[PDB]
Design a protein around this ligand. Structure first.
Ligand SMILES: CCCn1cnc(CCNC(=O)Nc2nc3ccc(-c4cncc(OC)c4)cc3s2)c1
Length: 843
């Protein structure tokens, strides 16, 4: 039971979806999946070390990069320690463990066991890890900052307490009975038919149509559709995709083999997803909850069970060629049969595996058999070093086979939380391509999230983001989330509970303000008053005392700095909110600044940001820093989210608006003055010039690769301290933005060269060819991003942008050349496409 039914309401209200609800299901898969997950939850709960769990030490086995060993000129590191305005600085060896450091500290003083917490954060320096390997440390040294730690006592694991739990040979065929809708769209007499496909990872196996019939609110064929495939030749995870044309208006899917390995039988009345008017919402096994407005379709099943000599030379080379080839290069029939015939050779090359397993006639019993024997002798794959790009490739929409997919997930098991975090978002999205609710991958996210509060925290927001936006996938995700929460342990349930109230509160406010200045560029006096009064109304009895900042879970925000909060001057009306630190042990009055925004789909931004982080760590692997500023951003519901404000930064545009602020002339010297005036010492200035040259360079390459490089001034920002960065990725060309104002900081004005600019192309090109060394990873992530993150998209040309840009199949010379030309376009065009935003105000 009873007090255990509150818990459920807690869960549902925490999730944003009621998973005990059974009104949008035609079977028990979700229920079954709720049951299936108890063990892997309990298992992981049971085996986690309570102390290290409560402190969630954020840590990495990566080597410390060159550019930070450079920053330590003494093989020794300073750490200020505090007890209560009593503090001493300690020389420490980069290889010193924390316990080891406590040894030397107790030694120092008086002439039990406490723990090193970071000043101002919910971050601890604990565990047999040399300090060189805690992230905070690496982050402090990056920025030229000191390292402030208070000594306090550990958090009681009691607070992580988890609740008690006490839980034939026949051809296949389908009777299309007919379809219904209540209200008919365009109205004038058109014509309509049903298309029934037998699908397996977007490979199509058979297809049947109906004769068409006049499009009216009710249409009844009552036909058998005898397909070409044999019942027994059906593979697990095969979808019966049902589609409607007149062209494509609606689609829906049914697993032909249920989660119990049972051929699917009987009557079904399926409510169908309308078209927007390829992508991952097409694949779903879910039905439209909206029974009242959706088109639907009746059908019937009743058809039970089921569960090397020497290769030539020039063929080996055709083979190696095929294998050695981007994920988007499609395979000829000729290729596929080659791969299949020489599968045992193909098997020694882990890079072949995606190509190889998509050369499988999955519509043949006998061949899948062989394909499993093939997976049996996995020596080489098991032993290969982890390649995430490769691994990821095998979790995309192209692979429905449960066992292919699961070897990829084997490979992830060896990732440390550091990397789990990098890829967490994409991996969560990759759930959408899983044929069944319960999957190896789902279970793996579950483990890793429960094992580590950082992953757990981000897992929560990532699943919740989707649950609240997508009906296609909310059911499945809601089940995974519920699984998580039942293991994360009441500490976090309270945290998530705080957090969820705050962002529901603050979105209420966000939307109410849009109502009050329609478009009208200016923001009425009236507006700001009301914003002020609401936030005051909120703070006085309703808002929590403090709360974790979802995009950065080490930060506890306290009260609002109402004075500093405002509505932004947008066509949308985002909030500029700022909070005090709730941590009194913090080093500053410097606020936490968060922007809330409705009107853009931030799921996209989230993705782009995550790819930015990935690029930054690729550059880590060649001892390269380009100071990208992939600020925090978390989507939270329908076209609405939050955004980390970056301290001390303005808009390239505004730096123009200041001096001239014209309707839109444009000047080249202005940026460089703006730096001087924000550099209290001329040598710090050269650091701004420094940071800028990198940041510019970073964003130049990145932005180009993603093809989001032609942007307006207003959507680029720089820090008072040189760090340039792009924003707002919800929104003649130019490849990327290299305006003449930038180049004047690089000591050039219209076609010359100079110390820092030589440096600029040097870094740029380094950066560029460095990402080409991870081509397949970027291609797979990008392609997935578009499939899980976008509007509709061409399953060739939208995606194919990024191979031409990564200049696939090219030696480093051509490529370097290519990139350099992409610079020279921005110097042909100078201010031209910048200038052009304005003009089309009327075109
Ligand atoms: C953060 C504490 C207050 N503060 C301390 N220094 C400043 C100077 C002003 N700094 C900024 O405005 N920084 C910004 N950072 C971002 C990051 C992202 C976005 C953004 C990204 N995407 C979509 C957007 O549309 C609203 C906005 C805007 C800003 S402004 C403000």
């Amino acid at each position: 039971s009873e007090e255990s039914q509150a818990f459920q309401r807690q869960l549902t209200a925490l999730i944003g979806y009621d998973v005990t609800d059974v009104s949008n299901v035609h079977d028990d898969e979700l229920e079954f999946t709720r049951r299936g997950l108890v063990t892997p939850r309990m298992a992981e709960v049971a085996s986690r070390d309570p102390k290290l769990y409560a402190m969630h030490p954020w840590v990495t086995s990566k080597p410390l990069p060159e550019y930070l060993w450079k920053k330590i000129a003494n093989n020794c590191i300073f750490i200020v320690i505090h007890r209560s305005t009593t503090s001493q600085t300690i020389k420490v060896s980069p290889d010193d463990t924390p316990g080891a450091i406590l040894q030397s500290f107790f030694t120092k003083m008086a002439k039990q066991d406490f723990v090193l917490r970071v000043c101002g954060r919910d971050e601890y320096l604990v565990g047999e890890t040399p300090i060189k390997n805690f992230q905070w440390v690496r982050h402090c040294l990056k920025n030229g900052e000191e390292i402030h730690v208070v000594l306090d006592t550990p958090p009681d694991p009691a607070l992580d307490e988890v609740r008690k739990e006490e839980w034939c040979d026949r051809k296949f065929r389908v009777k299309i009975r007919g379809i219904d809708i209540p209200v008919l769209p365009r109205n004038t007499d058109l014509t309509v038919f049903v298309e029934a496909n037998i699908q397996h990872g977007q490979q199509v196996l058979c297809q049947r149509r109906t004769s068409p019939k006049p499009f009216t609110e009710e249409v009844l064929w009552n036909v058998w559709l005898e397909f070409s495939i044999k019942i027994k030749d059906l593979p697990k995870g095969a979808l019966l995709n049902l589609q409607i044309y007149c062209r494509l208006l609606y689609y829906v899917n049914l697993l032909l083999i249920d989660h119990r390995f049972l051929l699917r039988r009987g009557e079904y009345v399926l409510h169908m997803w309308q078209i927007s008017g390829f992508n991952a919402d097409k694949l779903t096994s879910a039905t439209n909850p909206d029974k009242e407005n959706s088109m639907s379709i009746s059908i019937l099943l009743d058809n039970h069970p089921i569960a090397r000599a020497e290769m030539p030379n020039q063929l080996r080379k055709q083979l190696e060629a095929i294998i050695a080839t981007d994920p988007l290069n499609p395979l000829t029939a000729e290729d596929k049969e080659l791969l299949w015939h020489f599968r045992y050779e193909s098997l020694k090359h882990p890079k072949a595996y995606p190509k190889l397993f998509s050369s499988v006639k999955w519509g043949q019993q006998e061949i899948v058999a062989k394909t499993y024997q093939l997976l049996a002798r996995r020596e080489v794959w098991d032993q290969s070093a982890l390649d995430v790009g490769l691994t990821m490739q095998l979790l995309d929409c192209n692979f429905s086979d449960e066992n292919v997919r699961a070897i990829a997930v084997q490979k992830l098991e060896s990732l440390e939380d550091d990397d789990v975090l990098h890829y967490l978002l994409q991996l969560v999205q990759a759930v959408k391509f899983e044929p069944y609710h319960d999957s190896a991958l789902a279970r793996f996210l579950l483990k890793r999230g429960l094992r580590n509060k950082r992953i757990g925290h981000f897992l929560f927001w990532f699943l919740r983001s989707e649950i609240a936006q997508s009906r296609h996938y909310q059911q499945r995700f809601a089940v995974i989330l519920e699984a998580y929460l039942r293991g994360c342990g009441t500490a976090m349930l309270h945290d998530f509970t705080q957090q969820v109230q705050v962002i529901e509160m603050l979105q209420k406010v966000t939307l109410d303000i849009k109502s009050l200045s329609a478009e009208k560029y200016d923001v009425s006096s009236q507006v700001i008053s009301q914003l002020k009064q609401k936030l005051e109304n909120l703070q006085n009895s309703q808002l929590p005392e403090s709360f974790r900042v979802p995009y950065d879970p080490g930060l506890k925000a306290g009260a609002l700095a109402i004075e500093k909060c405002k509505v932004m001057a947008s066509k949308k009306k985002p909030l500029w909110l700022e909070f005090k630190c709730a941590d009194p042990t913090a080093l500053s009055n410097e606020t936490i600044g968060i922007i809330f925004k409705h009107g853009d789909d931030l799921r996209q931004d989230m993705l782009i940001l995550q790819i930015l982080r990935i690029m930054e760590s690729i550059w880590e692997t060649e001892s390269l820093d380009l100071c990208l500023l992939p600020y925090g951003c978390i989507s939270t519901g329908d076209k609405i989210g939050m955004i980390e404000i970056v301290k001390d930064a303005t808009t390239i545009a505004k730096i123009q608006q200041s001096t001239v602020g014209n309707t839109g002339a444009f000047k080249d010297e202005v940026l460089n003055h703006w730096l001087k005036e924000k550099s209290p010492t001329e040598e710090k200035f050269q650091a701004a010039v420094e940071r800028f040259v990198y940041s510019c360079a970073g964003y130049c390459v990145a932005t180009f690769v993603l093809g989001i490089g032609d942007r307006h001034n207003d959507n680029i920002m720089i820090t008072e301290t040189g760090n340039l960065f792009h924003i707002d990725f919800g929104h003649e060309r130019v490849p990327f933005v290299l305006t003449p104002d930038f180049l004047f900081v690089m000591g050039t004005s219209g076609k010359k060269t100079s110390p820092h600019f030589q440096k600029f192309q040097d870094i740029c090109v380094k950066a560029y060819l460095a990402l080409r060394h991870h081509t397949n990873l970027l291609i797979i992530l990008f392609s997935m991003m578009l499939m899980t993150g976008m509007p509709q998209l061409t399953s060739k040309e939208d995606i194919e942008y990024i191979r031409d840009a990564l200049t696939v199949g090219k030696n480093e010379e051509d490529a370097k050349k290519y990139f350099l030309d992409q610079i020279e376009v921005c110097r042909d065009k100078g201010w031209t496409v910048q200038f052009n935003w304005f003009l089309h105000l009327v075109l």
